Amino acid sequence: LRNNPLYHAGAVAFSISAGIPKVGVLMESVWNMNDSCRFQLRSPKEEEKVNEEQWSLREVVFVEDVKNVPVGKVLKVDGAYVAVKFPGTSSNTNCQNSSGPDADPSSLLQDCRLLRIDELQVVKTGGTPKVPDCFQRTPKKLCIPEKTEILAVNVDSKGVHAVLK
Amino acid sequence: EQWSLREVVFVEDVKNVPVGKVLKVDGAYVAVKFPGTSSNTNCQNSSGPDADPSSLLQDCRLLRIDELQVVKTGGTPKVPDCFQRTPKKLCIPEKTEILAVNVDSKGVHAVLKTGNWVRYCIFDLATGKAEQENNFPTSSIAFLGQNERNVAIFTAGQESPIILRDGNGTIYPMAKDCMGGIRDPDWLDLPPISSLGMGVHSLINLPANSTIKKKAAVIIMAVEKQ
């Protein structure tokens, strides 16, 4: 879909409140980084509600956009419209095994979304557009002034702090 | 051939009014299986349980909901038939006697007697009423002639001219005036006609560049020898 959010429901993130790092699964699609969204904390339906908090994305750091960036196979094209089978479109979560030859062919209709061609973006051999990782995997050099001696250093979210002689 | 719809009569609005069964609804978009949408005319037997599920997709059109109309238990909207299957009465004026009648696409043509008066009448089939009625400029007795049973109003067929006959067997020389009335009789100096033939004939024997049109009325006159 062309109208992709910044992060999708299901992305795993952590928030550091009260010094407790809390790990939670994003419950809704994020459209702007200055908003606040609900996260279900993860290690007859009250237990499902008991572990949601709403947090702002400043506080939250996404580890993974695990899922829910939707890629489907175009099963038909017609005029301005298209039929596309995406993973997870079936409201019947209990139909995870109808991949047999006896799959009621109405189920394949139930599985596919009907959209307009202009609402879709073609996925090329490079995969879906990756959200850039927020972990600086490799060491990055800092611009140390010349002819200076470093007496002490430390770190914080604010950046690097150092005493220079 | 390219035909002007004015001259065409549709016999039966046969087929090609496609009813589809809605197979899936997705917000404002829908998938509908309509008959004859499979470009593979050779898939007429894939109605088995092993029917490749992709074939069902190939068979159904994708549209928006606003482009569709629900078919109710009365079927598709019938185009009204152009053939008046049952007899329809015409609005005949009271106290009139009918001397002759004939037909054409223009409607019904009849000669009506009213006491000592004689009138020529054209009837509209939509309303059933006379579209125009005119008294003859000649004496009514002269039209009634020696034998009123001889009165007639012959036509060549469709799109035809009209030939009246009086009670003497004479062709009555009709013509409209510029007021919509009847001009003085432009006499023909003709003997009586015992019988007259009727029909329309093609003139395709003509060259395509002819000024004479590709149609004509053919009239055969059994003229009496005086």
Residue numbers in the entry:
A (entry chain B): 536 to 578, 640 to 761
B (entry chain C): 649 to 874
Please, what does the article write about this entry?
Here, we used genetic screens to identify the HECT-family protein ubiquitin protein ligase E3 component n-recognin 5 (UBR5) as the E3 ubiquitin ligase that governs agonist-induced degradation of numerous NRs and characterized these interactions biochemically and structurally. We next structurally interrogated functional domains in the context of full-length UBR5, which is expressed predominantly as a 310 kDa polypeptide product in humans. The N-terminal region of UBR5 arranges into a seven-bladed β-propeller, which shows weak homology to a regulator of chromosome condensation 1 (RCC1)-like domain (RLD). Following the RLD, a large helical region forms the core scaffold of UBR5.
We determined the structure of full-length UBR5 by cryo-EM, which, following further classification and refinement, reached ~3.9 Å resolution. Intriguingly, 2D class averages and the reconstructed 3D volumes showed a ring-like structure with distinguishable symmetric features. Size-exclusion multi-angle light scattering (SEC-MALS) identified a main species with a molecular weight of 1.385 MDa, consistent with a tetrameric assembly. The overall architecture of UBR5 is a closed and twisted ring with dihedral (D2) symmetry, held together by two distinct dimerization interfaces. A second dimerization interface holds together two halves of the ring and is markedly more flexible. Despite a lower local resolution in this region, the EM density map is consistent with the structure prediction from AlphaFold, showing tandem small beta bundles (SBBs), spatially separated but swapped in their primary sequences. In the context of the native tetramer, four SBBs link across the halves of the ring. In the structure of the UBR5 tetramer, the four HECT domains protrude towards the center of the ring cavity, separated by ~71 Å (within the same side of the ring) or ~91 Å (across opposite sides of the ring). Our 2D class averages consistently showed a blurry density in the middle of the ring. In the context of the full-length UBR5 tetramer, RARA/RXRA binds proximal to one UBR5 protomer, placing the NR within the ring, adjacent to the HECT domain of its dimerization partner and therefore also in the vicinity of the UBA domains.
